[PDB]
C-alpha cells in the first residue's frame, strides 16, 4: 500500500521534531489502513495519522508514532534517509 | 392476452410547412396491423422469448383483444420440437446426411443392377 | 478504374457569408478558422473540379472478325524482313523469314539449351539488344513500379500449352512465348507497329491453319 517515503526538508523537520514519518500511499487508502500497514510492516505503534491528497493526485500521510519509537531512527533503519 | 385500443393510429398533424397533400389527419392509418402491434408489445413484456403467432379473440367499443403465443428457445422441451426448431435453430452435421445418402445410393444401384437392368436392356 | 475520394474536398463545415464583409463570396470555414476559403476548386483544400471517375470507359471494344483480321495481318507482317527491321529487330543473322524451326525444339527444357538454339538460329543478337537496352525510365513510374523499360526481342510460338520450351525460353529479356491458339495483338505488334521477330515451331505452323480465320 505504501508507495514511498517523503524525504523533503519539511518531512525531515517533522521527523526530527514531532516523531512523524511522511509517506506516499495509494489514493484509496484510509487512515485505518495506513496505521495498520505502518504497524505491521515496521512493528511500531502509531499515535495518529493525518492524510491529504496532493495537487499532483497522490495521497500523503503524516504518521505520528507513539512515544517509544523514533521516526528518524526508523528512517535510518530502512535506509531511505 | 393483449388488450389494445382500436381505430387508426395516432397520426400527428404537422406543425411545420407542408404541401396540402401532406397535411391530412383523419383516415390515415399505419401499414402495421394491431395484431402485429400486440405481438411486439407481448415480446417487449417477455424479453428473450420469441413470438410464434397470434390470433384475434374479441372486440368491444374501444379495445381489441389478441392472444400471442411465445416460446422460450432456451427450454429443452422447446428446442427439440419439430415445429419450434424452425424458430429456435437446428443444425445437422453434413457427414451424417452425406454418409446416409451415399449408402442409400450404393444400395439402390446394387438393387437396380439385379431388378432393372434386364428390363431396361430388353 | 481510377478515381478520387467521392467526398474529397467537400466534408468541411463551410458556408458563403455573402457580401458586405469586404471579402470574396466563396464558401469559407464556419468555425474558428472562419475567413479561410473552402470547398471551391480554386481554394486550397477544395474539391477537384473534374476528377477521374471510376465509371469511365477505358476499354476500346473491337469486333471479333476485325480483331482476327488484324491478327492475320500481323502474322503476315512477321514474314517480311522489312517490317521486322522497321520495328527495330536485328535480323541480319536470321537465315530466312518467315522463321520456322522443327517441332523437336519444343522438348528443350533448359535455358542454356534454348540460348544455344537462339544462337544457332540467329536470334541471340536481338536478345542481346533487349538485354543491353533495358533502361530506367524517366518520370514517376519508378515510384509506382515501372522503373525498368525493357525492349522486345523474340516471340516464340509453340503448338500447345505446357511444352518445356516455354519454361526454357521465358526468362530471356524481351522474349514472349505463347501457344499458337493464344496469339494476340499484344505480342504480335508491340507498340502498335507491325512486324515482330517470331520463331515458329513447325507443329505450331501446322496448327495455325485452322485458327484466326
Amino acid at each position: 500500500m505504501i508507495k514511498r517515503f517523503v524525504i523533503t526538508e519539511k518531512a525531515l523537520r517533522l521527523a526530527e521534531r514531532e516523531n512523524k514519518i511522511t509517506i506516499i500511499v495509494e489514493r484509496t487508502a484510509t487512515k485505518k489502513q495506513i496505521a495498520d500497514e505502518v504497524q505491521r510492516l515496521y512493528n511500531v505503534k502509531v499515535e495518529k495519522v493525518n492524510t491529504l491528497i496532493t495537487p499532483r493526485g497522490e495521497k500523503k500521510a503524516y504518521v505520528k508514532l507513539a512515544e517509544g519509537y523514533s521516526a528518524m531512527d526508523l528512517l535510518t533503519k530502512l535506509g531511505v534517509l | 392476452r393483449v388488450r389494445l385500443i382500436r381505430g387508426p393510429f395516432n397520426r400527428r398533424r404537422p406543425d411545420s410547412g407542408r404541401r396540402p397533400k401532406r397535411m391530412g389527419v383523419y383516415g390515415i392509418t399505419a401499414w402495421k396491423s394491431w395484431r402485429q402491434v400486440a405481438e411486439e408489445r407481448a415480446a417487449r413484456k417477455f424479453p428473450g422469448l420469441e413470438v410464434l403467432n397470434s390470433y384475434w379473440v374479441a372486440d368491444d367499443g374501444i379495445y381489441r383483444y389478441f392472444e400471442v403465443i411465445l416460446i422460450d428457445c432456451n427450454q429443452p422441451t422447446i428446442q427439440r420440437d419439430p415445429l419450434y426448431s424452425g424458430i429456435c435453430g437446428r443444425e445437422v452435421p453434413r457427414r451424417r446426411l452425406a454418409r446416409r445418402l451415399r449408402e442409400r445410393q450404393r444400395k439402390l444401384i446394387e438393387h437396380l443392377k439385379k431388378t432393372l437392368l434386364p428390363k431396361l436392356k430388353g | 478504374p481510377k478515381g478520387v475520394y467521392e467526398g474529397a474536398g467537400k466534408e468541411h463545415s463551410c458556408e458563403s457569408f455573402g457580401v458586405g464583409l469586404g471579402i470574396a463570396r466563396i464558401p469559407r470555414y464556419k468555425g474558428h478558422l472562419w475567413p479561410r476559403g473552402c470547398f471551391a476548386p480554386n481554394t486550397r483544400g477544395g474539391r477537384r473540379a473534374h476528377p477521374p471517375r471510376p465509371e469511365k470507359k477505358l476499354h476500346e471494344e473491337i469486333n471479333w472478325k476485325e480483331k482476327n483480321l488484324a491478327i492475320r495481318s500481323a502474322i503476315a507482317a512477321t514474314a517480311y524482313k522489312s517490317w521486322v527491321a522497321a520495328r527495330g529487330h536485328m535480323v541480319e543473322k536470321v537465315p530466312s523469314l518467315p522463321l520456322v524451326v522443327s517441332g523437336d525444339a519444343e522438348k528443350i527444357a533448359k535455358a542454356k539449351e534454348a540460348k544455344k538454339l537462339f544462337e544457332v538460329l540467329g536470334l541471340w543478337p536481338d536478345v542481346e539488344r533487349a538485354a543491353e537496352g533495358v533502361k530506367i525510365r524517366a518520370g514517376k513510374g519508378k515510384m509506382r513500379g515501372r522503373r525498368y523499360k525493357e525492349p522486345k526481342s523474340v516471340l516464340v510460338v509453340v503448338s500447345e500449352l505446357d511444352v518445356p520450351l516455354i519454361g526454357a525460353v521465358r526468362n530471356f529479356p524481351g522474349v514472349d512465348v505463347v501457344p499458337v491458339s493464344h496469339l494476340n495483338m499484344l505480342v504480335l505488334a508491340p507498340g502498335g507497329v507491325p512486324g515482330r521477330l517470331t520463331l515458329w515451331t513447325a507443329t505450331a505452323v501446322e496448327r495455325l491453319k485452322g485458327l484466326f480465320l
Partner: protein, 121 residues
C-alpha cells in the same frame, strides 16, 4: 516474413518495419571459398567474433574482427574500418553486411552449428 508484392512501397515498408527476427536475415554474407569448402554452406548471418573482409568502400581490402552488430540499422562495426573524431576518439564506420565476405567463423555457439547443418542439408 517480407512481402511478396512487386510494389516498391510494399517492399520498402516490409524492409523498414520488419521485426528483429526477420532483420536477422539481412545480415547474411558470402563465405570465402575455403570456408565454403569447409562448411558446405554459401552464406551465414554475420556474428560478433567473426572475421570478415571488406569488399567495397574506402576500407576495401581490410580484414578484421566484427566488434558490434546492430540489428535495427542492419549495420556492423569492423575492426580496422575506423577513424578519429575532432576530439581524438576512435569511431567505427557502419558497414552493411552485404559488402563483406566471411573468412573466419565463430562457431562456439551451439545454435550456429544447427543453422550450418540446416543450410548444408
Amino acid at each position: 516474413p517480407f512481402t511478396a508484392s512487386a510494389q516498391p512501397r510494399k517492399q520498402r515498408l516490409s524492409l523498414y518495419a520488419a521485426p528483429l527476427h526477420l532483420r536477422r536475415k539481412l545480415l547474411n554474407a558470402k563465405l570465402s571459398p575455403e570456408l565454403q569448402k569447409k562448411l558446405g554452406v554459401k552464406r551465414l548471418p554475420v556474428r560478433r567474433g567473426d572475421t570478415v573482409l571488406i569488399m567495397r568502400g574506402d576500407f576495401k581490402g581490410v580484414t578484421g574482427k566484427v566488434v558490434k552488430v546492430d540489428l535495427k540499422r542492419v549495420r556492423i562495426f569492423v575492426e580496422g574500418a575506423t577513424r578519429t573524431n575532432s576530439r581524438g576518439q576512435t569511431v567505427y564506420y557502419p558497414i552493411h553486411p552485404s559488402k563483406v565476405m566471411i573468412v573466419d567463423v565463430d562457431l562456439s555457439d551451439k545454435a550456429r552449428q544447427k543453422l550450418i547443418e540446416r543450410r548444408k542439408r
